[PDB]
Amino acid sequence: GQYL
Amino acid sequence: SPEQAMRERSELARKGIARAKSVVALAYAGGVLFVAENPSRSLQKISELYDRVGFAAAGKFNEFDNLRRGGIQFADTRGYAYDRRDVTGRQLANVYAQTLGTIFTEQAKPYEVELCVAEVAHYGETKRPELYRITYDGSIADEPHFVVMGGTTEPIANALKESYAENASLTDALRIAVAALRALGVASLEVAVLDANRPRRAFRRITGSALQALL
């Protein structure tokens, strides 16, 4: 998760 | 088959690169401008690497962040051994590419990252800003005007293609970059410059009230  | 597996790996990497915040870097009169779409206040996608060398990335934060650290590491030791003016954006751009290729070939999962290394001239000297883009496989490309990383790069790249102007001031290049990036709000914007006019450390963040006034 927490893609950026 | 191995070839099929390689194709699958490439597709996976492409998907990872695609689902990410977009970053742009472009040359302007005072140096290079990084403008990234970043909501968090602690996690950053733009960083100083050395005196005149900056760095932007797009993908998976822990990995691009890890490269950030590796790049910082190499420059300091090299400078101590020889000197500050010997570390160049070119050498750093090269190191990341080789490392990425070897790492991908021997590791399990490829780094879903896209890198941009930027360099400006030293104080009291004339030279054009250099932008390099390093992709997940190790490929490296020399860009004359601007780099766009992460997300859907086509619309932003085209909007920049129409709006770009060499020797645009800081405010104009900021308007162009935010406009082409929209293809937003004052909040959640990470903006920094490689100001060629600074004596030594060229990297400088532009945050808060000053940024609001500019925009």
Binding site: - | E48, R69, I72, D76, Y80
Partner: protein, 222 residues
């Protein structure tokens, strides 16, 4: 060698002479012994020239390295600690003769009162440090004469400029009573070097100002 540092209301000043000897022989007439290690600290080092320049360089590198990794400079306390650990590390070589002692001047941006945010810190060969609170410090072969001069001259310090003049005078007396410390060379035009730190950072005093102060002192004594 002799390096003085004194607080003034609103800042700190740090000055050092220029001579470097080998025995009785004058070998360097223009060495710079006071460095700007960062935007709020200057460092003077007395002692073996090699070990001195190396200390200064490496410490500056380390301060700035942590600053780049963490996105914020260390507190003045952390800086004091790292310098102390370096000094403690050179102890084995200092017993063998390669001794180098640093005097660290800084301006604490986080202090409560800006008028007394100046900071002077002194070290021994064993890495212990002490935060000076009587307003001034010095290091080197002329340090005793310099301190005994500043004890009397220090009531005159009221701002950045008067503090600078007092620094230059203290150096003049160090050199006047010790042969390893060089005074202002009027013939070759070589004067002590000085760094001023206040709320706005650290700047080198341009040579002309030090030249005028030195000429004023020299004419006063004639």
């Amino acid at each position: 060698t002799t390096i003085v540092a004194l607080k003034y209301p609103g800042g700190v000043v740090m000055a050092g002479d220029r001579r470097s000897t080998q025995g009785n022989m004058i070998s360097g007439r223009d060495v710079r012994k006071v460095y700007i290690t960062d935007d709020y600290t200057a460092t003077g080092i007395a002692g073996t020239a090699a070990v001195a320049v190396e200390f200064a360089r490496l410490y500056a590198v380390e301060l700035e390295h942590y600053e780049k990794l963490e996105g914020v400079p260390l507190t003045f306390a952390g800086k004091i600690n790292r310098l102390a650990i370096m000094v403690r590390g050179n102890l084995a070589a200092a017993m063998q003769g390669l001794l180098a002692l640093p005097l660290l001047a800084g301006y604490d941006i986080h202090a409560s009162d800006p008028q007394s945010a100046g900071r002077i810190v002194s070290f021994d060969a064993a890495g212990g440090w002490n935060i000076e609170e009587e307003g001034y410090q010095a290091v080197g072969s002329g340090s005793l004469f310099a301190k005994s001069s500043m004890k009397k001259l220090y009531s005159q310090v009221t701002d950045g400029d008067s503090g600078l003049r007092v620094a230059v005078e203290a150096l003049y007396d160090a050199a006047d009573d010790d042969s390893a410390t060089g005074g202002p060379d009027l013939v070759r035009g070589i004067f002590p070097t000085a760094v001023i730190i206040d709320a706005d950072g650290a700047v080198d005093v341009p040579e002309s100002r030090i030249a005028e102060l030195a000429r004023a002192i020299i004419e006063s004594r004639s």
